[PDB]
From Swiss-Prot:
Active site: 203, 327, 440
MF term (GO), any: laminin binding
Cell location: Synapse; Secreted; Cell membrane
GO BP annotations, alphabetical order: acetylcholine catabolic process; acetylcholine receptor signaling pathway; cell adhesion; osteoblast development; positive regulation of cold-induced thermogenesis; receptor internalization; regulation of receptor recycling; retina development in camera-type eye
Enzyme class: hydrolase
Record SUPFAM superfamilies: alpha/beta-Hydrolases (SSF53474)
Protein name in UniProt: Acetylcholinesterase
EC number: 3.1.1.7
Length: 535
């Protein structure tokens, strides 16, 4: 050193880092990008739990985002912003275990509450370097320390031969835990308070957060949690050991392959060969199902998430959970016949019946009959607009809204302080059609405060709204309470309770309190539907 910025040189347990001074709209922030937290999970290390990064010599350059974990790249709508924003924005590589830190400039003297972001992407995609996960605004406006990590997705992160030494499963979840441990040891070097760590994530990110709650060794690593449109419970976020074993063995066959000899062969295959056959191992034609997800191993997860939340002690737990207005709409264009971004997707009754089989791929004929019965409007059973919207509701309720209601109730009844929301504002900038409403993942840009960037063409009300949400989230991280103790007449956000079931709406209007999270409909999915599976 000698001639460089004093605020950009930090030491962590593994060596020295040089960061970068970035511009946020209201002033500068410090960013430390692509910090390695694990040994590169390559060669013989593929499918294995991550090993902590061995110390380095000299000053590591941390001024750019690192590799994105090897993954499927989406091709459904070539050129289209609505899909491309989720695509990898850095080189794909198995050498991808790096994390990022944003702090105020200059760094705070008094220790500051830490927010850790875990991205979604169905456990097959995602990256902490996407524009919608830009930590600069929360760092600058709210004085937060913000951390995000890459974790292995797809086969690399989740292929499992349960029981074996060489592919135990859930290793993507372990990548996340390693980063949480890295925050505990090192975040005070950046002015962060390791005793005030909040996890937040959206859709497999949310489900990820939920699994850290349910897994004891992760519980000591954080204090509060946010789950946006995602739960560890529900139909897509985990598979049984048997089901994981089956998908893993099948995928091996597809690429040319005693567990040891199997995995050893898999390790000789190029990454791209595994991505190429990833989608061919699902049991049924489906949407909102992903090939390689967390497995119930009797380790990371001691029992099913359903079981762990029924019988769990959550006395010391503060949790914020919610959903977007249209949870189901996004995935309909990925393989329900009739749906497209390019038209209004008015469908027939036949397409709806077919849609229900694809969207609830585990239903018997009788259970699918029940779904269809409940979601048909019997005044207008053949109306294309209702059928289109009902198909969206079926997917959203089954996969997100009802799992979230189930989780909120079981947490509240067992000690937890729970706050609940529904996000209802469709961004002025959205590129998806109007019929998709507010699709999942389109709250994220507001929480991270992108509208504060004048170059992005958000409206002024959207700028004020973004600030409102950043406040809710950072208040919650600080205190376990989204409300401001100061401002006391602007309507309060009540905790969600089994008794009253209150949650708030999030839009341009001030907070409105509501009761019952799709209560009638969720009784159908969460209480009745399991009984119908036992016939």
């Amino acid at each position: 050193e000698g001639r460089e910025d004093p605020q950009l040189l930090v030491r962590v347990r593994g060596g020295q880092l040089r960061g970068i001074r970035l511009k946020a709209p209201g002033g500068p922030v410090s960013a430390f990008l692509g910090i390695p937290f694990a040994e590169p999970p390559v060669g013989s290390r593929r499918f294995m739990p991550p090993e902590p990064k061995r110390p380095w010599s000299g000053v590591l350059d941390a001024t750019t985002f690192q590799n994105v974990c090897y993954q499927y790249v989406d091709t459904l709508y070539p050129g289209f912003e609505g899909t491309e924003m989720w695509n990898p924005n850095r080189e794909l590589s198995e050498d991808c275990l790096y994390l990022n830190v944003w702090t105020p400039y200059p760094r705070p003297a008094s220790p500051t509450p830490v927010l850790i972001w875990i991205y979604g992407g169905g456990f097959y995609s995602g990256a902490a370097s996407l524009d919608v996960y830009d930590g600069r605004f929360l760092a600058q406006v709210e004085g937060a320390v913000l951390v995000s990590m890459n974790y292995r997705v797809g086969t690399f992160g989740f292929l499992a031969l349960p029981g074996s030494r060489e592919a135990p499963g859930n290793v993507g979840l372990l990548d996340q835990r390693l980063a949480l441990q890295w925050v505990q040891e090192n975040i005070a070097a950046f002015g962060g308070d390791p005793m005030s760590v909040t996890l937040f994530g959206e859709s497999a990110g949310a489900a990820s957060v939920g699994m850290h709650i349910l897994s004891l060794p992760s519980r000591s690593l954080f204090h509060r949690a946010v789950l946006q449109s995602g739960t560890p419970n529900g139909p897509w976020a985990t598979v049984s050991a048997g089901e994981a074993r089956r998908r893993a063995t099948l995928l091996a066959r597809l690429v040319g392959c005693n567990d040891t000899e199997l995995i050893a062969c898999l390790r000789t295959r190029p990454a791209q060969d595994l991505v190429d056959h990833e989608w061919h191992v699902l049991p049924q034609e489906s949407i909102f199902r992903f090939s390689f997800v967390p497995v119930v191993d009797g380790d990371f997860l001691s029992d099913t998430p359903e079981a762990l939340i029924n019988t769990g002690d959550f006395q010391d737990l503060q949790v914020l959970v919610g959903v977007v207005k249209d949870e189901g709409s996004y995935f309909l264009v990925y393989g329900v016949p009739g749906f497209s971004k390019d038209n209004e997707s008015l469908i027939s009754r036949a397409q709806f019946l077919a849609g229900v089989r694809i969207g609830v791929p585990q239903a018997s004929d009788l259970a699918a009959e029940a779904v269809v019965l409940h979601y048909t409007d019997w005044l207008h059973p053949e109306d294309p607009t209702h059928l289109r919207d009902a198909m969206s509701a079926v997917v959203g309720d089954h996969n997100v809204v009802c799992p979230v209601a189930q989780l909120a109730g079981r947490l509240a009844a067992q000690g937890a302080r729970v706050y609940a929301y529904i996000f209802e504002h469709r961004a002025s900038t959205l590129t998806w059609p109007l019929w998709m409403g507010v699709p999942h993942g389109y709250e994220i840009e507001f929480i991270f405060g992108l509208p504060l960037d004048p170059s992005l063409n958000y409206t002024t009300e959207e700028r004020i709204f973004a600030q409102r949400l950043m406040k809710y989230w950072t208040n919650f991280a600080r205190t376990g309470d989204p409300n401001d103790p100061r401002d006391s007449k602007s309507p309060q956000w009540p905790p969600y309770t089994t008794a009253a079931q209150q949650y708030v709406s999030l839009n341009l209007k001030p907070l409105e309190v509501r009761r019952g999270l799709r209560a009638q409909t969720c009784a159908f999915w969460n209480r009745f539907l399991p009984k119908l599976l036992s016939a």
